[PDB]
Amino acid sequence: DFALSLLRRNVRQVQTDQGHFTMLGVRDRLAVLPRHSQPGKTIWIEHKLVNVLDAVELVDEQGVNLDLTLITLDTNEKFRDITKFIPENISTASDATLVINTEHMPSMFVPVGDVVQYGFLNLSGKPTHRTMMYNFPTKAGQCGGVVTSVGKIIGIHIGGNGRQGFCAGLKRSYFA
């Protein structure tokens, strides 16, 4: 129920020069993407070209790569504010669902099971922190996917090795 309404109201198909991604709209004109999507000044959102007002790579007190980029979109439409569904602290989970929505992989829900603390992750040679892991064969095209569990939004899909998948953890304070 919660995953379905999240998909409808907040999860959008996008394309950058790096390919297809799922984008989570967070509130108003603010949305989050995996860093490796490398959004430019213009982004493709559901068959429309959209101006990107600002893009900031997510940094926390530690000053390390979290593999997320916050963008502000030049749009009329305002995302439903879902920050209250993002935990105040990075949260592991059981019975999690990955919500993917791109032009090539539209509106798909994947039960990934337990989402456990993982932390540091070397993603194709690039150091990444505060990740969590699920034992599910995620694949190319699923980055940006939104990890959800029991009414909470807990991560964004960023990588996998064919047998396991990994997400960047989400905390409410990222979007304050």
Would you tell me which residues interact with ligand AG7 (CB under 6 A)? 19, 36, 123-124, 126, 138-143, 158-161, 164-165
| Three-state DSSP state, 171 | coil
Q: Residue 118: name the closest of 172, 154, 70, 69 by CA.
A: 154
Nearest distance, CB of residue 137 and ligand AG7, angstroms: 8
Q: Would you say 19 or 87 has its CB closer to ligand AG7?
A: 19
Least distance from ligand AG7 to the Cβ atom of residue 76, Å: 29
H or E element that contains 4: helix 2-10
Strands (E), the chain: 11-16, 19-27, 30-34, 42-45, 48-57, 68-73, 93-100, 108-123, 126-134, 146-149, 152-160, 165-169
Closer CB to ligand AG7, 77 or 103, in the complex: 103
Nearest distance in Å: CB 68, ligand AG7: 11
Task: Give phi and psi for 133, each to the nearest 5.
Answer: -125, 145
Query: Which residue lies nearer to ligand AG7 by CB, 29 or 115?
Result: 115
DSSP, collapsed to helix, strand or coil, labels residue 26 as strand
Residue 29 or 148: the one with the smaller Cβ distance to ligand AG7 is: 148
Task: Return the number of the residue (69 or 142) whose C-beta is nearest ligand AG7.
Answer: 142
At closest approach, how far in Å is the CB of 176 from ligand AG7? 25
Residue 25 CB, shortest distance to ligand AG7, in Å, is 19
**Residue whose structure tokens are 């101006």:** 51
Tell me which residue has its CB nearest to ligand AG7.
Answer: 160
Q: How far apart are CA 88 and CA 94, in angstroms?
A: 18
